[PDB]
Design a protein around this ligand. Structure first.
Ligand SMILES: *[C@@H]1C[C@@H](O)[C@@H](O)[C@@H](CO)O1
Ligand SMILES: *[C@@H]1C[C@@H](O)[C@@H](O)[C@@H](CO)O1
Ligand SMILES: [Mg+2]
Ligand SMILES: [Mg+2]
Ligand SMILES: [Mg+2]
Ligand SMILES: [Mg+2]
Ligand code: NA
Ligand code: NA
Ligand code: NA
Ligand code: NA
Ligand code: NA
Ligand code: NA
Lengths: 1011, 204, 193
């Protein structure tokens, strides 16, 4: 049969999909959501053997364990146990595109289990097995007898074992195929693995049972009244004595309850459903569910007899909320949302695609703590627990069918084909059938990157028809097709259009008002966070707040998909595409998250948190106007804290509880600001602090901040009389300046400061030289490959221009003595292939005080590509424990990604000044710095810097962080100007014009002195 | 041109058509027809089938066609004759002046049906003037209404030819037989004979 | 497999649907809609045998004519040849309502045909068989080897026989089921044949 190469056969003997069941036989346990004796986990130790193809599997295996098999933990992805290599390919299918066929060599996972079954489960009722996740297709045998077949690696497949089991010891046999016709619809950009990777369980239901139930909540005009409607279906023999009671609870209080026999209303000429019944419960003043306040009730549905004998009970958490699109806006409980979303894959650096509650909770808490309120299940239905958690913790969820055919050419080749309709359909219908009762799901998604085909329009309608309660969305085919209620592009820019033919990405602002367009636009993906990215994030936040119909988006994405590998010494390191011998592969493209695989945040996360703050501020005079962006709750767990500091030195501060209604404003007058004695700039910082712990945060949690410069007092204070005069020593080859026990040497042929001594201690390992390039970022690189250059990428433009190859030719090097100083003057050209790319002119004024004042003026040929930076660099001989500075921090920050950073006095261990991106590149910059301290040195001015043990050269020659080695001394990069990092997407130039170094002529000044 | 989908015998009528598990089988009966017949100019309208209630599978299917072949309207009478799965109000047996307010699926007078609040589609009966036996009494009343009302655009009489079959007597002479004449049970006797013409084409 | 009791399986190995074709190798003929030598009719006399259930069908049939068979015209409805009764039921299903199951006594019509294929058809190209109407489901074999399966008694079911015929005499065997899960979608007010 090769059922695995036939999309017309997606399963055999599989039971209907339904909401989460547990078959409680006690109503209070169902009420309390306690573990059910009728629902058992078979997770644990199973038997496993790997085969190269289904054909190589021995018949024997069906009746008995293969000696050669191993004992392994289930759930798991067999690649994570080393049986075979996980593959990381983005768009290109990991198998030849020749649908519906798959390779003859098809890795086969044979799992088996010997377990007990109680007679009580067999003497009556129905016993079924549930495979929550099997990637990608499988055959099931029970006690050597064939049961059935299942496809769709992202939804549970259930089978009735009733007739196959026997009291006592039983044997399950599971043959899992790595590739199947289903893989054609599973082309998501992530690691390609296989196995039984989600839960395995046994569920017992009575023969007369609840076979399905739908819970709906509808409201009056101002949501002060609701009707809970519960449609219940049964299976088994109908009898007049059967009844269904549905009861609604608010904690221990029973809110409402309705009982009725089966027999629904007339549907058509043939009657109604004798096997269903709809209970209707009235609820006054329901407590509404929202990401802000996730209030839930509990619905308990009891199947029982007229005398009161309980047969069984099913149950769910219910959130009272209404989702609707009205007048072009997506409303929740009647208010327009502002989605602070993120896409999130099910990924664990050690367990691969196996999800545990701990990691789930970890993610949800970080998310909330970081001001996210929404999540998109990229790109398949999630492990069941995910929904319980979102319901309870409060996240708006986009549930998405497991459908992605990116690999086809054109992309809708399979989706526009009626022969793939059925397969696609089940991916949609079974998702709905499973998740329809979770309040956290507020939107349905047709899947991802499958172009736009007719099957999509058909599927869009089915849903709208069966569940009018949630909008349907879908990005394929241009993001605004007839298959979507929401304009939901991926990587559309704020202001700049990308008019691709057939599927342009318009500026979002512009897309809204295209002729005839009226829908809401919420990006399904934006601000691609690969490496040192998120450049321009604020720009999205500013347009979302200004335009009502711009309702947010989903950042791409939450966590890097890196895998843990171990070196010969047994140490672990983070691996990406190709690191397993997988080819072809897409290397680092699997690492696009705000947090590392291990949950440690990337610097970008803080930028996200600050822009997604729910409190907005304005300052006027001594007045601070705080506006709440909450739609439902009052600022009941917030205090505003403020502080005024002169150049990092605290002058005053204070606190005020916030008491602002959702969308309201609150004015706070600051007390008169005592004048200040001394030059410097006053800065006002405010912080929103939650005094009390919550289900998602700890007491003290800071939820928002903002700063403003206040008055500045310029220094006009004339220095002071130098106790000494520096001496100049002129030689053939060098200009030397000596002052006290300090010495500086400027080489005459190079034109650079090559050595500086403190006493007899040399301070430099490499001379102080201009620097115009940076170890390319992921964004600079784009998709360019040595194997296939992308001439338009930033890195390729710089290469080709000779930026990395350009060498300093000296034009001038003079020394002059002034009244109290020695002045060195130098001029250097950087050329390549006869073209002058940059010209740097400087002065070094060393004075009586030992301060070295450096002035830098640079010219950039207009026709050369704009450089990554314009700074100086050097390798210091010393290494120091801390880095102290006066400027923006404390975390890494770049021009287009510095909003979250605060101007203040920061002090960190040197290592915190390096950002360990898996794929190394320029990193650790801090901008707007007025003073930098390292060891005995201090640099003063208005610059950008990074300090670390790694040169830019090493960084750029190194592809994996674990392979970096600290060099001798400390590498210091001090930039007058640095280019923005971009990130609108990571495969095409994305740095906004305003962040390019295009002025042509640049000036900066610096003071290097000892402390 | 109508898909080969009729599940009249289910209780309620849309038991299968509202069942996703049945969406695939159904889809192929709809998509295969279109793929085959979409180039015939004579086909001016697509039909989703007959007497299978109104199910979500119908809405889905309706949309598919709308998408793939916008050159022709889609009609379907199940579940009320005016659901979201039909471009045309296409009841069977609705009367001219007389309403038949059955629950869930009333059969309004045709004239009245067109102006129900919010209604704007054209109305063309998928079935009317049941010609069984000595029938067609009140035929002119439909024509009078179709001519006077722009949106009453006609209908399809039920039906063309008696489904009677030939049998031989002991003498070998032929005779017209209907339901039950073959030992078939249960059967619906003469209900299979409702044509304007006899099984050999002679006119009634 | 009991393919006829599973709405999840409506065909096996069937070719995509498409508008009428004739593969003319002459453009003037195509213009005038003249008969095409590439489109051959198999209509006429076939061998048919009737059974009460698919289980009653003997294996022998697959490779060899049943001496017990009759010669009958095709196309036809077997009720009209007297092998069984046609049923006139309006609304009530002629079979017990228990989707997607059907009765175990299920009239089975075993059609076969021996016919010739010229080498020319086999040296190059593709040879398909087209069944325009088969009520209500069937399995097809060619030269004793299984080819495919199909349902929907009112659309053409097509299969590639390219890899199964040989120059000269060939044998088709078609097992036709009266009732199938497709019968659930075929409850029209008319004779059940
Ligand atoms: C959006 C779709 C997602 O699966 C990723 O491919 C992302 C790019 O890294 O784009
Ligand atoms: C409309 C449907 C058709 O097939 C017949 O049942 C007719 C009455 O004879 O009504
Ligand atoms: Mg398959
Ligand atoms: Mg993709
Ligand atoms: Mg079937
Ligand atoms: Mg009927
Ligand atoms: Na907005
Ligand atoms: Na990616
Ligand atoms: Na407060
Ligand atoms: Na690198
Ligand atoms: Na008219
Ligand atoms: Na009739």
């Amino acid at each position: 049969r090769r059922d695995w190469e036939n999309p017309g056969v997606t399963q055999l003997n599989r039971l209907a999909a339904h909401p989460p069941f547990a078959s409680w036989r006690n109503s209070e346990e169902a009420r309390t959501d306690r573990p059910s004796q009728q629902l058992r986990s078979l997770n644990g130790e199973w038997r496993f053997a790997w085969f190269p193809a289904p054909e190589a599997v021995p018949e024997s295996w069906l009746e008995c364990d293969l000696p050669e098999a191993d004992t392994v933990v289930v759930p798991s992805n067999w690649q994570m146990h080393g049986y075979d290599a996980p593959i990381y390919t983005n768009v290109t299918y990991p198998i030849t595109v020749n649908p519906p066929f798959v390779p003859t060599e098809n890795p086969t996972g044979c799992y088996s289990l010997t377990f007990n079954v109680d007679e009580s489960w067999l003497q009556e009722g129905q016993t079924r097995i549930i495979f929550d996740g099997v990637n990608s297709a499988f055959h099931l045998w029970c006690n050597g007898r064939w049961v059935g077949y299942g496809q769709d690696s992202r939804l549970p497949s259930e089978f009735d074992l009733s007739a196959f089991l026997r009291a006592g010891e039983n044997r399950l046999a599971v043959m899992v195929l790595r590739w199947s016709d289903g893989s054609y619809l599973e082309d998501q950009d992530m690691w390609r693995m296989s196995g039984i990777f989600r839960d395995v369980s046994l569920l017992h239901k009575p023969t007369t049972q609840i076979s399905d139930f739908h819970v709906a909540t509808r409201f009056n005009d101002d949501f002060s009244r609701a009707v809970l409607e519960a449609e219940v279906q049964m299976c088994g023999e109908l009898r007049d004595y059967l009844r269904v009671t549905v009861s609604l609870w608010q904690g221990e209080t029973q809110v409402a309850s309705g009982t009725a026999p089966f027999g629904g209303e007339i549907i058509d000429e043939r009657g109604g459903y004798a096997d269903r019944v709809t209970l209707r419960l009235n609820v006054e003043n329901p407590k509404l569910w929202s990401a802000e306040i996730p209030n839930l009730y509990r619905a308990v549905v009891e199947l029982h007899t007229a005398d009161g004998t309980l047969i069984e009970a099913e149950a769910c958490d219910v959130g009272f909320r209404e989702v609707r699109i009205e007048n072009g806006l997506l409303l929740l409980n009647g208010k327009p949302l502002l989605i602070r979303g993120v896409n999130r894959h099910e990924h664990h650096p050690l367990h691969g695609q196996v999800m545990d509650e701990q990691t789930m909770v970890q993610d949800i808490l970080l998310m909330k703590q970081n001001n996210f309120n929404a999540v998109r299940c990229s790109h398949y239905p999630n492990h069941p627990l995910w929904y319980t958690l979102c319901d309870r913790y409060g996240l708006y969820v986009v549930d998405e069918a497991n459908i992605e055919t990116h690999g086809m050419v054109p992309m809708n080749r399979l989706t526009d084909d009626p022969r793939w309709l059925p397969a696609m359909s089940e991916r949609v219908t079974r998702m709905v059938q499973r998740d329809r009762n979770h309040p956290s799901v507020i939107i349905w998604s047709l899947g991802n990157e499958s172009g736009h085909g007719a099957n999509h329009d058909a599927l869009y309608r089915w849903i709208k028809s069966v569940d009018p309660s949630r909008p349907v969305q879908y990005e394929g085919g241009g993001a605004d097709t007839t298959a979507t209620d929401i304009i939901c592009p991926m990587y559309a820019r704020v202001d700049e259009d990308q008019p691709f033919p057939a599927v342009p990405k318009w500026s979002i602002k512009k897309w809204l008002s295209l002729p005839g367009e009226t829908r809401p636009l919420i990006l399904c993906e934006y601000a691609h966070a690969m490496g040192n990215s998120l450049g321009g994030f604020a720009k999205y936040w500013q347009a979302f707040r200004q335009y009502p119909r711009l309702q947010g988006g989903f950042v791409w994405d939450w966590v890097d998909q890196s895998l843990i590998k171990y070196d010969e010494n047994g140490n672990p390191w983070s691996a990406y595409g190709g690191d397993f011998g997988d080819t072809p592969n897409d290397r680092q493209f699997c690492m696009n998250g705000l947090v590392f695989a291990d949950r440690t945040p990337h610097p970008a996360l803080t930028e996200a948190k600050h822009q997604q703050q729910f409190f907005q501020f304005r300052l006027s005079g001594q007045t601070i106007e705080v506006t709440s962006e909450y739609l439902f709750r009052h600022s009941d767990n917030e205090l505003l804290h403020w502080m005024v500091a002169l150049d990092g030195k605290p002058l005053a501060s204070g606190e005020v509880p916030l008491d602002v209604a959702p969308q309201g404003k609150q004015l706070i007058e600051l007390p008169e600001l005592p004048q200040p004695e001394s030059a410097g700039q006053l800065w006002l910082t405010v912080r929103v602090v939650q005094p009390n712990a919550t289900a998602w945060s700890e007491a003290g949690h800071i939820s928002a901040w903002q700063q403003w410069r206040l008055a500045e007092n310029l220094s006009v204070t004339l220095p002071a009389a130098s106790h000494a005069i520096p001496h100049l020593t002129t030689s053939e080859m060098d200009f030397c300046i000596e002052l006290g026990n300090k010495r500086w040497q400027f080489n005459r042929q190079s034109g650079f400061l090559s050595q500086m001594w403190i006493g007899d201690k040399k301070q430099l390992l490499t001379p102080l030289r201009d620097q115009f390039t940076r170890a390319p970022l992921d964004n600079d690189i784009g998709v360019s490959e040595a194997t296939r250059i992308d001439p338009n990428a930033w890195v390729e433009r710089w290469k080709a221009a000779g930026h990395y190859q350009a060498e300093a030719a000296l034009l001038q090097c003079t020394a002059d003595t002034l009244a109290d100083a020695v002045l060195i003057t130098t001029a250097h050209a950087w050329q390549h292939q006869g073209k002058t790319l940059f010209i740097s002119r400087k002065t070094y004024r060393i004075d009586g005080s030992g301060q070295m004042a450096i002035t830098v003026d640079v010219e950039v040929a207009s026709d050369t590509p704009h450089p990554a930076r314009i700074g100086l660099n050097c390798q210091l001989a010393q290494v120091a424990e801390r880095v102290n500075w006066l400027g923006l921090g404390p975390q890494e920050n770049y021009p287009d990604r510095l909003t979250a950073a605060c101007f203040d006095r920061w002090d960190l261990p040197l290592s915190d000044m390096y950002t360990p991106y898996v794929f190394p590149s320029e990193n650790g910059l801090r901008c707007g710095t007025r003073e930098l301290n390292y060891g005995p040195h201090q640099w003063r001015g208005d610059f950008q810097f990074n300090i670390s043990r790694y040169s830019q050269q090493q960084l750029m020659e190194t592809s994996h962080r674990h392979l970096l080695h600290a060099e001798e001394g400390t590498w210091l990069n001090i930039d007058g100007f640095h280019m923005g990092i971009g990130g609108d997407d990571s495969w095409s130039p994305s740095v906004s014009a305003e962040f390019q170094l295009s002025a042509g002529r640049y000036h900066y000044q610096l003071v290097w002195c000892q402390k």
